[PDB]
Structure formats: structure tokens, C-alpha cells
Amino acid sequence: MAVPPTYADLGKSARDVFTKGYGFGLIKLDLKTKSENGLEFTSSGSANTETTKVTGSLETKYRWTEYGLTFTVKWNTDNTLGTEITVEDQLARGLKLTFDSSFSPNTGKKNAKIKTGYKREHINLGADMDFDIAGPSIRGALVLGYEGWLAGYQMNFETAKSRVTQSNFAVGYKTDEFQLHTNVNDGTEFGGSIYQKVNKKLETAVNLAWTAGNSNTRFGIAAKYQIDPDASFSAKVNNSSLIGLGYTQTLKPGIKLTLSALLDGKNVNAGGHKLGLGLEFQA
């Protein structure tokens, strides 16, 4: 298997904006770990002071060394859990088929996803077919980066030779001391993210993304600070005037603690400062 936990390998800043409407201020319970000798286990959940029970998800990765099949059983209490199972057609090396029986898109049906291709921290290329019940929607994706450079393609490529409008592309440029990587979705969504370093123990980032005329605005600036090698700190600020901050450091033995702080400001809605608490027990 060559499909490690690198889902966040791509631009994270663009996703950072999600924090805006990600229910800022809540409790998070994380434990276990994926990377390990033999089997893997990842436990992640959340909870808050409301009129409902706590939420949690437990994923168990169990594989065998007799043929070449990976059995992933994920159970718990959340919007969806489903399951997953990795299988190889003929040659596992070069072409693998990961069955994603996870109902991510909670709408009210039997959603299903199936990944087909070859991934790798050094180079990822392949397509994925997901859908509800009707025909499976296949999409092409390829994430790879060269010496001081980056390249990412994402399109269904339904056509054979003719050019198709529906196609998302991303160009990354890693300069000596300047990070500039842009991307466009279906030649309609304008996305641009860059990163730069200020001090030896401080860095700043910027994320600018606009649409073709919608309320999906994604323009703003971010901050980064790594006072320590094990610890990590970051922040975010946009026209909304929202002061966001995220800290994460370890204890000593293994238990890691992640603290979050968000400060919004508006009159139309209820103003105030909120702080998030997240725990991680990997060791």
C-alpha cells in the first residue's frame, strides 16, 4: 500500500477559510494513530455543551500478509461511518483499487466511493469514482512536486482528445524564498495561495480566492509561527475582521494538546470571543 495519510498534502490555507463556518469553539477528542508497525487505528471525535450526546469516530485498519487485501472497519457515533477495504486487481504496485464505503455526503441515500490509481508522498496520480446510486462519477487527480516546483491537476477528462471546459488545474511555484502557487477550477473559480518567511521563528502566509460572482469569497491573509520544533502556531485574518489563532504542542511522553482561539466581530449577529479545545493521544 502507498496511500498514506496525506490528504492535507495540498493547499491547506484554502481550506482554512472553512473555520469561518466550522462551528468555532468546541471540544475535540483525538487518540490512537495511523502510521504504525502492523495495524493502524485512528480515533477522532467532538462534543459541546448542548442538548445532544457527544460525537466520535473510530477507524480500525487491519491488513493481512497472505495475499494482498486490506480490511478497514470504521465504527462509532457520527453523521456517517460506513467502511473501507483496499483491493488490488492484478498488480498492487502501480495500480490499486481502494473501496471507500464511507457515506461522506450525508443526503439521505446509499452513497459510495471507490478510489482507483496509485498514490505516493513523492508522486500521486489516479482517479476516483463516487456517487449515490446512478452512474459512478469518475474524476482525475494528480498531485506531484519537483525541485522547487509544484504541479496539481484535477479533472474528469471525460473526453478523449477534444478539450473540455470542466477541468480544474493548479500550478505551484516554489522559489528560493518565495512560495507562489495558484489554481483555477473549471476556468471559473480563481484560487491563489502564497507563503513567505519573515523571521527565523516566524512566517506569514496569504490566501486569495474569488469566484465568478458568488458569496463563496475566499480572500484573506494568514499567519504562522513555530517557536518550537514540536510545537506549532498559526493564525488567520480577513476583511471580516476575524482574529483566528491555532496552537498545538506536545506534553512530554506523547500526549499532544491543541488549543484554538477565535475572535469575531459583528453587530448583525451575536458577537464575542470563542476558544476551542482539542486533545490528541497518539502515545
Side-chain angles (χ1 to χ4, degrees):
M1 302 168 54
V3 186
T6 74
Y7 276 66
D9 67 323
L10 275 90
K12 182 93 92 288
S13 51
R15 282 197 183 280
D16 206 82
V17 298
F18 204 55
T19 191
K20 278 201 75 60
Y22 198 51
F24 48 82
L26 39 68
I27 303 168
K28 199 165 75 197
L29 286 86
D30 202 307
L31 24 143
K32 315 234 180 312
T33 334
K34 293 170 169 277
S35 298
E36 204 162 10
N37 200 323
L39 302 318
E40 317 182 336
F41 307 99
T42 330
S43 165
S44 70
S46 330
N48 40 245
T49 39
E50 285 293 290
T51 70
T52 36
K53 68 176 86 69
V54 303
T55 331
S57 85
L58 187 95
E59 314 176 17
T60 75
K61 213 99 81 191
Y62 206 112
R63 74 187 161 165
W64 294 327
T65 49
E66 63 188 312
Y67 181 43
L69 273 290
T70 328
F71 289 92
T72 302
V73 181
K74 44 185 83 276
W75 190 79
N76 246 219
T77 309
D78 213 343
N79 289 358
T80 170
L81 48 102
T83 190
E84 171 178 20
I85 178 179
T86 327
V87 189
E88 48 157 316
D89 177 32
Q90 284 280 285
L91 198 58
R93 288 159 271 286
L95 209 170
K96 59 149 68 210
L97 176 79
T98 321
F99 212 120
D100 270 17
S101 219
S102 157
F103 314 87
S104 140
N106 179 239
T107 182
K109 298 290 278 294
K110 199 193 79 68
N111 281 269
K113 324 217 170 185
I114 300 171
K115 318 296 280 279
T116 175
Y118 202 51
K119 274 157 282 289
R120 208 204 271 282
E121 278 169 320
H122 301 167
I123 178 179
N124 321 264
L125 81 171
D128 47 70
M129 57 194 63
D130 149 70
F131 220 70
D132 177 16
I133 177 59
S137 182
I138 68 180
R139 182 192 305 185
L142 197 154
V143 179
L144 167 147
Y146 214 62
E147 287 158 306
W149 198 57
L150 267 162
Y153 278 95
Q154 207 196 42
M155 49 187 165
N156 298 51
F157 208 65
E158 62 210 272
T159 35
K161 54 186 175 293
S162 200
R163 285 195 72 71
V164 56
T165 330
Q166 175 164 292
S167 276
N168 160 35
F169 65 84
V171 186
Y173 270 92
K174 212 181 204 189
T175 341
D176 276 82
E177 281 88 64
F178 294 96
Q179 304 203 1
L180 163 58
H181 46 284
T182 190
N183 78 305
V184 189
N185 210 106
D186 191 2
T188 308
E189 315 183 20
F190 297 102
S193 171
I194 62 177
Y195 197 100
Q196 195 175 301
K197 62 94 211 187
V198 180
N199 203 17
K200 270 82 75 74
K201 311 182 80 77
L202 200 160
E203 311 188 302
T204 53
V206 190
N207 60 100
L208 46 150
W210 293 284
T211 349
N214 289 70
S215 67
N216 297 299
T217 342
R218 192 194 285 171
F219 77 108
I221 312 177
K224 196 75 166 156
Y225 203 117
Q226 32 54 267
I227 182 152
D228 272 72
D230 296 325
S232 210
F233 187 55
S234 77
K236 76 93 90 180
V237 181
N238 290 36
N239 263 50
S240 46
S241 323
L242 166 66
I243 309 179
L245 321 88
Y247 183 79
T248 299
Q249 193 172 44
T250 185
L251 188 87
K252 247 160 141 183
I255 182 166
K256 209 151 68 154
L257 302 159
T258 74
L259 210 162
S260 325
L262 279 90
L263 322 169
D264 204 279
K266 69 206 293 200
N267 208 79
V268 182
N269 281 109
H273 63 93
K274 300 280 272 191
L275 315 170
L277 209 170
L279 174 74
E280 173 181 352
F281 185 66
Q282 64 187 8

Short mmCIF file of all heavy atoms in Angstrom, two decimals, residues 125-167:
data_model
loop_
_atom_site.label_atom_id
_atom_site.label_comp_id
_atom_site.label_asym_id
_atom_site.label_seq_id
_atom_site.Cartn_x
_atom_site.Cartn_y
_atom_site.Cartn_z
N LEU A 125 -0.97 9.98 -8.50
CA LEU A 125 -1.70 10.04 -9.77
C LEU A 125 -2.77 8.96 -9.83
O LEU A 125 -2.51 7.79 -9.52
CB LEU A 125 -0.73 9.89 -10.94
CG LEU A 125 -0.31 8.47 -11.28
CD1 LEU A 125 0.47 8.44 -12.59
CD2 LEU A 125 0.53 7.88 -10.16
N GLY A 126 -3.98 9.34 -10.24
CA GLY A 126 -5.06 8.39 -10.34
C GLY A 126 -6.42 9.06 -10.36
O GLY A 126 -6.52 10.29 -10.33
N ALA A 127 -7.48 8.26 -10.43
CA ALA A 127 -8.84 8.78 -10.46
C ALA A 127 -9.71 8.11 -9.40
O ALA A 127 -9.35 7.06 -8.87
CB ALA A 127 -9.45 8.59 -11.84
N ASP A 128 -10.85 8.73 -9.10
CA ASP A 128 -11.77 8.19 -8.11
C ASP A 128 -13.21 8.25 -8.61
O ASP A 128 -13.64 9.27 -9.15
CB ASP A 128 -11.64 8.96 -6.79
CG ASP A 128 -11.64 10.46 -7.00
OD1 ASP A 128 -12.70 11.01 -7.37
OD2 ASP A 128 -10.58 11.09 -6.80
N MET A 129 -13.94 7.16 -8.43
CA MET A 129 -15.33 7.09 -8.87
C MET A 129 -16.27 7.02 -7.67
O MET A 129 -16.29 6.03 -6.93
CB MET A 129 -15.54 5.87 -9.77
CG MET A 129 -15.15 4.55 -9.11
SD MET A 129 -15.01 3.20 -10.30
CE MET A 129 -13.67 3.79 -11.33
N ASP A 130 -17.05 8.08 -7.48
CA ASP A 130 -18.00 8.14 -6.37
C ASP A 130 -19.37 8.60 -6.85
O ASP A 130 -19.49 9.30 -7.86
CB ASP A 130 -17.49 9.08 -5.28
CG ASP A 130 -18.61 9.77 -4.53
OD1 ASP A 130 -19.32 9.08 -3.77
OD2 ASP A 130 -18.77 11.00 -4.70
N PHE A 131 -20.41 8.20 -6.13
CA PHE A 131 -21.78 8.57 -6.48
C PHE A 131 -22.78 7.98 -5.49
O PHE A 131 -22.40 7.27 -4.56
CB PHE A 131 -22.11 8.10 -7.90
CG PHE A 131 -22.91 9.09 -8.69
CD1 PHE A 131 -22.34 10.28 -9.12
CD2 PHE A 131 -24.23 8.83 -9.01
CE1 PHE A 131 -23.08 11.19 -9.84
CE2 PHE A 131 -24.97 9.74 -9.74
CZ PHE A 131 -24.40 10.92 -10.16
N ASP A 132 -24.06 8.27 -5.71
CA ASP A 132 -25.11 7.76 -4.83
C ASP A 132 -25.57 6.38 -5.29
O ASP A 132 -25.23 5.37 -4.68
CB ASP A 132 -26.29 8.73 -4.81
CG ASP A 132 -27.45 8.22 -3.97
OD1 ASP A 132 -27.23 7.28 -3.18
OD2 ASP A 132 -28.56 8.76 -4.11
N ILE A 133 -26.35 6.35 -6.36
CA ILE A 133 -26.87 5.09 -6.90
C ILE A 133 -26.68 5.02 -8.41
O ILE A 133 -26.30 3.98 -8.95
CB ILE A 133 -28.36 4.90 -6.56
CG1 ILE A 133 -28.89 3.62 -7.21
CG2 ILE A 133 -29.16 6.11 -7.03
CD1 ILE A 133 -28.15 2.37 -6.77
N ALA A 134 -26.95 6.13 -9.08
CA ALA A 134 -26.81 6.20 -10.53
C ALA A 134 -25.37 5.94 -10.96
O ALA A 134 -24.55 5.49 -10.16
CB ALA A 134 -27.28 7.56 -11.05
N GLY A 135 -25.07 6.23 -12.22
CA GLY A 135 -23.73 6.02 -12.73
C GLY A 135 -22.67 6.64 -11.85
O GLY A 135 -22.84 7.74 -11.32
N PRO A 136 -21.54 5.94 -11.68
CA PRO A 136 -20.42 6.41 -10.85
C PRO A 136 -19.70 7.60 -11.47
O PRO A 136 -19.35 7.57 -12.65
CB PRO A 136 -19.50 5.19 -10.78
CG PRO A 136 -19.80 4.41 -12.01
CD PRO A 136 -21.27 4.62 -12.28
N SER A 137 -19.48 8.64 -10.68
CA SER A 137 -18.80 9.83 -11.15
C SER A 137 -17.29 9.71 -10.97
O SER A 137 -16.79 9.80 -9.85
CB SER A 137 -19.32 11.07 -10.41
OG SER A 137 -18.70 12.25 -10.89
N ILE A 138 -16.58 9.51 -12.07
CA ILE A 138 -15.13 9.38 -12.03
C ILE A 138 -14.45 10.73 -12.21
O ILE A 138 -14.87 11.54 -13.03
CB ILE A 138 -14.62 8.41 -13.11
CG1 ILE A 138 -14.83 9.01 -14.50
CG2 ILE A 138 -15.32 7.07 -12.99
CD1 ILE A 138 -14.36 8.11 -15.63
N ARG A 139 -13.39 10.97 -11.43
CA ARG A 139 -12.65 12.22 -11.51
C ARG A 139 -11.15 11.97 -11.50
O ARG A 139 -10.65 11.15 -10.72
CB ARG A 139 -13.04 13.14 -10.34
CG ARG A 139 -12.35 14.49 -10.38
CD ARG A 139 -12.53 15.24 -9.07
NE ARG A 139 -13.94 15.39 -8.71
CZ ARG A 139 -14.37 16.09 -7.67
NH1 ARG A 139 -13.50 16.71 -6.89
NH2 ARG A 139 -15.66 16.17 -7.41
N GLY A 140 -10.43 12.67 -12.36
CA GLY A 140 -8.99 12.51 -12.43
C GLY A 140 -8.25 13.47 -11.52
O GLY A 140 -8.62 14.63 -11.40
N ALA A 141 -7.20 12.97 -10.87
CA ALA A 141 -6.41 13.79 -9.96
C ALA A 141 -4.94 13.37 -9.98
O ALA A 141 -4.63 12.18 -10.08
CB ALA A 141 -6.97 13.70 -8.55
N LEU A 142 -4.05 14.35 -9.88
CA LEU A 142 -2.62 14.08 -9.89
C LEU A 142 -1.85 15.17 -9.15
O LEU A 142 -1.79 16.31 -9.60
CB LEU A 142 -2.10 13.96 -11.32
CG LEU A 142 -0.74 13.29 -11.50
CD1 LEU A 142 -0.62 12.68 -12.88
CD2 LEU A 142 0.38 14.29 -11.26
N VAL A 143 -1.27 14.82 -8.01
CA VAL A 143 -0.51 15.77 -7.21
C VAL A 143 0.96 15.38 -7.15
O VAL A 143 1.32 14.32 -6.62
CB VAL A 143 -1.06 15.87 -5.77
CG1 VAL A 143 -0.24 16.84 -4.95
CG2 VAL A 143 -2.53 16.28 -5.79
N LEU A 144 1.82 16.24 -7.68
CA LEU A 144 3.25 15.99 -7.69
C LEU A 144 4.04 17.30 -7.65
O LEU A 144 3.57 18.33 -8.13
CB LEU A 144 3.64 15.19 -8.94
CG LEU A 144 5.14 15.13 -9.25
CD1 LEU A 144 5.49 13.80 -9.90
CD2 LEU A 144 5.55 16.28 -10.15
N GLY A 145 5.23 17.25 -7.07
CA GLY A 145 6.06 18.44 -6.97
C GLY A 145 7.51 18.16 -7.31
O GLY A 145 8.07 17.14 -6.89
N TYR A 146 8.13 19.06 -8.07
CA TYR A 146 9.52 18.91 -8.46
C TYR A 146 10.43 19.81 -7.64
O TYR A 146 9.95 20.59 -6.81
CB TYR A 146 9.69 19.22 -9.95
CG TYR A 146 10.76 18.39 -10.63
CD1 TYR A 146 10.64 17.01 -10.71
CD2 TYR A 146 11.88 18.99 -11.19
CE1 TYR A 146 11.62 16.24 -11.32
CE2 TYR A 146 12.85 18.23 -11.81
CZ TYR A 146 12.72 16.86 -11.87
OH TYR A 146 13.69 16.11 -12.49
N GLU A 147 11.73 19.70 -7.87
CA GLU A 147 12.70 20.51 -7.14
C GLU A 147 12.34 21.99 -7.21
O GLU A 147 12.52 22.64 -8.24
CB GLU A 147 14.11 20.30 -7.71
CG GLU A 147 14.71 18.95 -7.34
CD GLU A 147 15.80 18.52 -8.31
OE1 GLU A 147 15.54 18.49 -9.53
OE2 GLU A 147 16.92 18.21 -7.84
N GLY A 148 11.83 22.52 -6.10
CA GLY A 148 11.44 23.92 -6.06
C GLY A 148 10.28 24.23 -6.97
O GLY A 148 10.18 25.34 -7.51
N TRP A 149 9.40 23.26 -7.16
CA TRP A 149 8.23 23.43 -8.02
C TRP A 149 7.08 22.55 -7.55
O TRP A 149 7.27 21.62 -6.77
CB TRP A 149 8.59 23.11 -9.47
CG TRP A 149 7.60 23.65 -10.46
CD1 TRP A 149 7.22 24.95 -10.60
CD2 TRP A 149 6.87 22.90 -11.44
NE1 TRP A 149 6.29 25.06 -11.62
CE2 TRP A 149 6.07 23.82 -12.14
CE3 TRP A 149 6.82 21.55 -11.79
CZ2 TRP A 149 5.22 23.42 -13.18
CZ3 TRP A 149 5.98 21.16 -12.81
CH2 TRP A 149 5.19 22.09 -13.50
N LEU A 150 5.88 22.85 -8.04
CA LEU A 150 4.69 22.08 -7.68
C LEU A 150 3.69 22.04 -8.83
O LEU A 150 3.53 23.02 -9.56
CB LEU A 150 4.03 22.69 -6.44
CG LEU A 150 4.45 22.10 -5.10
CD1 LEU A 150 4.08 23.04 -3.96
CD2 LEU A 150 3.82 20.73 -4.89
N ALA A 151 3.03 20.90 -9.00
CA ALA A 151 2.05 20.73 -10.06
C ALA A 151 0.89 19.86 -9.60
O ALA A 151 1.09 18.77 -9.07
CB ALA A 151 2.71 20.13 -11.30
N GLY A 152 -0.33 20.35 -9.81
CA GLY A 152 -1.51 19.60 -9.41
C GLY A 152 -2.64 19.71 -10.42
O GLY A 152 -3.08 20.80 -10.76
N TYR A 153 -3.10 18.56 -10.91
CA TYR A 153 -4.18 18.53 -11.89
C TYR A 153 -5.41 17.83 -11.32
O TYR A 153 -5.30 16.85 -10.59
CB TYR A 153 -3.72 17.82 -13.16
CG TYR A 153 -2.93 18.71 -14.10
CD1 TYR A 153 -1.54 18.74 -14.06
CD2 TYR A 153 -3.58 19.52 -15.03
CE1 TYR A 153 -0.82 19.55 -14.92
CE2 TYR A 153 -2.86 20.33 -15.89
CZ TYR A 153 -1.48 20.34 -15.83
OH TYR A 153 -0.77 21.15 -16.68
N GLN A 154 -6.59 18.34 -11.68
CA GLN A 154 -7.84 17.77 -11.20
C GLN A 154 -8.95 17.98 -12.22
O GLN A 154 -9.49 19.08 -12.36
CB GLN A 154 -8.24 18.39 -9.86
CG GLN A 154 -9.09 17.47 -9.00
CD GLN A 154 -9.78 18.21 -7.87
OE1 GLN A 154 -10.30 19.32 -8.06
NE2 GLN A 154 -9.79 17.61 -6.68
N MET A 155 -9.30 16.91 -12.94
CA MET A 155 -10.35 16.98 -13.95
C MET A 155 -10.86 15.59 -14.30
O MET A 155 -10.10 14.61 -14.26
CB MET A 155 -9.84 17.69 -15.20
CG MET A 155 -8.50 17.16 -15.70
SD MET A 155 -7.83 18.13 -17.06
CE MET A 155 -6.13 17.56 -17.07
N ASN A 156 -12.14 15.49 -14.65
CA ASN A 156 -12.74 14.22 -15.02
C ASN A 156 -12.14 13.68 -16.32
O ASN A 156 -11.96 12.48 -16.47
CB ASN A 156 -14.25 14.37 -15.16
CG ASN A 156 -14.92 14.78 -13.86
OD1 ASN A 156 -14.51 15.75 -13.22
ND2 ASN A 156 -15.96 14.06 -13.48
N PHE A 157 -11.85 14.59 -17.24
CA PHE A 157 -11.27 14.21 -18.53
C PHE A 157 -12.15 13.18 -19.23
O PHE A 157 -11.65 12.18 -19.75
CB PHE A 157 -9.86 13.66 -18.33
CG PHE A 157 -8.97 13.85 -19.53
CD1 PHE A 157 -8.62 15.12 -19.94
CD2 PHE A 157 -8.49 12.76 -20.24
CE1 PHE A 157 -7.80 15.31 -21.04
CE2 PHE A 157 -7.67 12.94 -21.33
CZ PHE A 157 -7.33 14.21 -21.74
N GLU A 158 -13.45 13.42 -19.23
CA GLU A 158 -14.40 12.51 -19.87
C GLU A 158 -14.10 12.36 -21.36
O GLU A 158 -14.23 11.28 -21.93
CB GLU A 158 -15.83 13.00 -19.67
CG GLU A 158 -16.10 14.36 -20.30
CD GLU A 158 -17.16 15.15 -19.55
OE1 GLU A 158 -18.35 14.99 -19.88
OE2 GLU A 158 -16.79 15.93 -18.64
N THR A 159 -13.69 13.46 -21.98
CA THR A 159 -13.37 13.46 -23.40
C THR A 159 -12.10 12.66 -23.68
O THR A 159 -11.35 12.34 -22.76
CB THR A 159 -13.19 14.89 -23.94
OG1 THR A 159 -12.58 15.72 -22.94
CG2 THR A 159 -14.53 15.49 -24.35
N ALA A 160 -11.87 12.35 -24.95
CA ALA A 160 -10.69 11.59 -25.35
C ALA A 160 -9.58 12.51 -25.84
O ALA A 160 -8.46 12.47 -25.33
CB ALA A 160 -11.06 10.58 -26.43
N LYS A 161 -9.90 13.35 -26.82
CA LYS A 161 -8.93 14.28 -27.38
C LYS A 161 -9.44 15.72 -27.27
O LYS A 161 -8.69 16.63 -26.93
CB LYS A 161 -8.64 13.94 -28.84
CG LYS A 161 -9.88 13.85 -29.71
CD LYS A 161 -9.55 13.36 -31.11
CE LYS A 161 -10.81 13.17 -31.94
NZ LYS A 161 -11.65 12.06 -31.43
N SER A 162 -10.72 15.91 -27.58
CA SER A 162 -11.33 17.23 -27.52
C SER A 162 -11.16 17.85 -26.14
O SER A 162 -11.20 17.15 -25.13
CB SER A 162 -12.82 17.15 -27.88
OG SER A 162 -13.31 18.41 -28.28
N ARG A 163 -10.98 19.17 -26.10
CA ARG A 163 -10.81 19.88 -24.84
C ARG A 163 -12.15 20.09 -24.15
O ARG A 163 -13.14 20.46 -24.78
CB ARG A 163 -10.13 21.23 -25.08
CG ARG A 163 -8.64 21.12 -25.37
CD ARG A 163 -7.95 22.47 -25.25
NE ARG A 163 -7.84 22.91 -23.86
CZ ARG A 163 -7.02 22.35 -22.98
NH1 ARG A 163 -6.24 21.34 -23.34
NH2 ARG A 163 -6.98 22.81 -21.73
N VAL A 164 -12.18 19.85 -22.84
CA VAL A 164 -13.40 20.02 -22.06
C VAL A 164 -13.28 21.20 -21.10
O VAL A 164 -12.26 21.37 -20.44
CB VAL A 164 -13.73 18.74 -21.25
CG1 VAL A 164 -12.56 18.36 -20.36
CG2 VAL A 164 -15.00 18.94 -20.44
N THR A 165 -14.34 22.00 -21.02
CA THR A 165 -14.36 23.16 -20.14
C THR A 165 -14.20 22.75 -18.69
O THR A 165 -13.39 23.32 -17.95
CB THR A 165 -15.66 23.97 -20.30
OG1 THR A 165 -16.16 23.84 -21.64
CG2 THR A 165 -15.43 25.43 -19.97
N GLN A 166 -14.97 21.75 -18.27
CA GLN A 166 -14.92 21.26 -16.90
C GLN A 166 -13.57 20.62 -16.60
O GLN A 166 -13.37 19.43 -16.84
CB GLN A 166 -16.04 20.25 -16.65
CG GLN A 166 -15.99 19.61 -15.27
CD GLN A 166 -17.29 18.93 -14.89
OE1 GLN A 166 -18.31 19.59 -14.68
NE2 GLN A 166 -17.26 17.61 -14.80
N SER A 167 -12.64 21.42 -16.08
CA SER A 167 -11.31 20.94 -15.75
C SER A 167 -10.59 21.90 -14.81
O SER A 167 -10.38 23.07 -15.15
CB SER A 167 -10.48 20.75 -17.03
OG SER A 167 -10.75 19.49 -17.63
#
